[PDB]
Write a protein that holds these residues in place. Structure first.
Motif, short mmCIF file in Angstrom:
data_model
loop_
_atom_site.label_atom_id
_atom_site.label_comp_id
_atom_site.label_asym_id
_atom_site.label_seq_id
_atom_site.Cartn_x
_atom_site.Cartn_y
_atom_site.Cartn_z
N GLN A 6 0.94 -1.38 0.15
CA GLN A 6 -0.04 -0.24 0.18
C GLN A 6 0.61 1.20 0.12
OE1 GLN A 6 -3.13 -0.28 -1.02
NE2 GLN A 6 -3.47 -2.37 0.48
N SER A 7 2.10 1.47 0.98
CA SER A 7 2.99 2.30 1.20
C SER A 7 3.77 2.71 -0.52
CB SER A 7 4.08 2.73 1.88
OG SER A 7 5.04 1.66 1.99
N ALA A 8 3.82 1.41 -0.90
CA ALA A 8 4.62 1.48 -2.43
C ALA A 8 4.36 2.29 -3.21
CB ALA A 8 4.91 0.19 -3.04
N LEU A 9 2.65 1.33 -3.50
CA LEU A 9 1.38 2.48 -4.55
C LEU A 9 1.02 3.85 -4.01
CD1 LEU A 9 -0.61 1.36 -6.76
CD2 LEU A 9 -1.90 0.78 -4.77
N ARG A 10 1.60 3.90 -2.77
CA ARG A 10 0.95 5.79 -1.98
C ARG A 10 1.97 6.13 -2.75
NH1 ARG A 10 -0.82 8.83 2.06
NH2 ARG A 10 -2.04 8.05 2.51
N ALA A 11 2.94 6.45 -2.60
CA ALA A 11 4.09 6.72 -3.13
C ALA A 11 4.62 7.00 -4.33
CB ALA A 11 5.53 6.09 -2.16
N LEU A 12 4.59 5.82 -5.07
CA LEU A 12 4.42 6.15 -7.34
C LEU A 12 3.22 7.22 -6.80
CD1 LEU A 12 4.29 2.17 -8.35
CD2 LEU A 12 6.03 4.26 -8.04
N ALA A 13 1.95 7.21 -6.28
CA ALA A 13 0.87 7.66 -6.78
C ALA A 13 1.37 9.83 -6.25
CB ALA A 13 -0.48 7.51 -6.20
N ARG A 14 2.06 9.65 -5.11
CA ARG A 14 2.09 10.67 -4.66
C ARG A 14 3.27 11.69 -5.33
NH1 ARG A 14 0.42 14.42 -0.84
NH2 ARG A 14 2.08 15.17 -1.38
N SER A 15 3.89 10.63 -6.06
CA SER A 15 5.31 11.77 -6.27
C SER A 15 5.30 11.81 -7.94
CB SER A 15 6.28 10.84 -6.02
OG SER A 15 7.10 9.44 -7.50
N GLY A 16 4.59 11.98 -7.92
CA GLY A 16 3.76 13.01 -9.67
C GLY A 16 4.12 11.65 -10.86
N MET A 17 3.52 10.71 -10.95
CA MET A 17 3.43 9.35 -11.70
C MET A 17 1.98 9.30 -11.66
SD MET A 17 4.98 7.53 -12.99
CE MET A 17 7.32 7.87 -13.49
N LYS A 18 1.43 8.78 -12.60
CA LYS A 18 -0.53 8.34 -13.26
C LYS A 18 -0.72 7.07 -13.09
CE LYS A 18 -1.36 12.53 -13.70
NZ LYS A 18 -2.49 13.43 -12.35
N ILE A 19 -1.46 5.96 -12.17
CA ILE A 19 -1.90 5.41 -11.73
C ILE A 19 -2.97 4.50 -13.06
CG2 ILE A 19 -2.41 3.72 -10.57
CD1 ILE A 19 0.15 5.28 -10.14
N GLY A 20 -2.74 3.75 -13.33
CA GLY A 20 -3.53 3.48 -15.07
C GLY A 20 -4.63 1.49 -14.44
N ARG A 21 -4.47 0.82 -14.96
CA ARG A 21 -5.17 -0.64 -15.06
C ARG A 21 -4.65 -0.70 -13.28
NH1 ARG A 21 -10.06 0.42 -17.47
NH2 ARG A 21 -9.01 1.75 -19.30
N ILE A 22 -5.16 -1.67 -12.38
CA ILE A 22 -4.77 -2.28 -11.27
C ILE A 22 -5.00 -3.34 -10.78
CG2 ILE A 22 -4.08 -1.42 -8.27
CD1 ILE A 22 -4.73 0.71 -8.70
N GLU A 23 -3.90 -3.89 -11.17
CA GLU A 23 -4.47 -5.89 -11.13
C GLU A 23 -4.27 -6.41 -10.14
OE1 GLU A 23 -6.61 -7.66 -12.53
OE2 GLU A 23 -5.98 -9.08 -13.91
N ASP A 24 -4.46 -7.51 -9.48
CA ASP A 24 -3.80 -8.42 -8.46
C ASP A 24 -3.46 -9.46 -9.43
OD1 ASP A 24 -3.73 -11.17 -6.80
OD2 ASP A 24 -3.74 -9.35 -5.58
N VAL A 25 -2.18 -10.36 -9.27
CA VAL A 25 -1.48 -11.01 -9.68
C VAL A 25 -0.14 -12.55 -9.46
CG1 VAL A 25 -1.27 -9.19 -12.24
CG2 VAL A 25 0.46 -9.87 -10.19
N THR A 26 -1.13 -11.77 -7.67
CA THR A 26 -1.05 -13.11 -6.81
C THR A 26 -1.00 -14.78 -7.77
OG1 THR A 26 -0.36 -14.85 -4.47
CG2 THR A 26 -2.60 -12.79 -5.39
#
Length: 135
Positions: free
Chosen positions: A97-117
């Motif tokens: 969650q923190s990695a995803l939030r840091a990606l979004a918060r640091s000027g990156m644009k998020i596309g489709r989110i998918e779980d692939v475990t």
RNA sequence: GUUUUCGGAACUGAGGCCAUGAUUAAGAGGGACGGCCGGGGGCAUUCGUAUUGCGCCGCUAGAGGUGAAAUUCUUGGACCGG
């Protein structure tokens, strides 16, 4: 060097977030997945075994990943989050969650989110005994 | 000498009143039949991811493992991604 085509549009990569309970991987790669842009784990950001999977280490790793991808021309990211999977746990680790939030918060644009475990149709035996691990 | 059937013994050739003679069909059981039903069984045959190896394609030099008490590869590229 990078794609300087159509500055008004997005250049899409794929971020494979592997969040195990030991450490977390922030791996941005090509759209196809074959070419990798940068992979920064939580272990190359903290000098201690325990904090390898911490949310703070994941935030640092995602910040460095986003910085490298921005300097490499990639503007938007598709998210493919995975846990350990297999016969082991299917819940993503503390740093996802923190990695995803840091990606979004640091000027990156998020596309489709998918779980692939990796989910078995049915698996081999787990590493524990029949009585489980007793600590 | 020879007295054939009326208180008995075999070979049994014919026919008749037999009210001629088979209780019922267990909210016992077996079996048949009918349409189904079930991860029941055996044989063969498909499929699914996962795991582990293997071959290729991209790096800091890290990943594993346990609340920081270690073993476990390496310019022979691990982990990760395809």
């Amino acid at each position: 060097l990078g794609p300087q085509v159509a500055e008004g549009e997005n250049v899409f990569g794929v971020c494979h977030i592997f969040a195990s309970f030991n450490d977390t991987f922030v791996h941005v790669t090509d759209l196809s997945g074959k070419e990798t842009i940068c992979r920064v784990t939580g272990g190359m950001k903290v000098k201690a075994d325990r904090d390898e999977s911490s949310p703070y280490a994941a935030m640092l790793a995602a910040q460095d990943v986003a910085q490298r991808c921005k300097e490499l021309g990639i503007t938007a990211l598709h998210i493919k989050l995975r846990a350990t999977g297999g016969n082991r746990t299917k819940t993503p680790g503390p740093g996802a969650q923190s990695a995803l939030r840091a990606l979004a918060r640091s000027g990156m644009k998020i596309g489709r989110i998918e779980d692939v475990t990796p989910i078995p149709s049915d698996s081999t035996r787990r590493k524990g005994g029949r009585r489980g691990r007793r600590l």
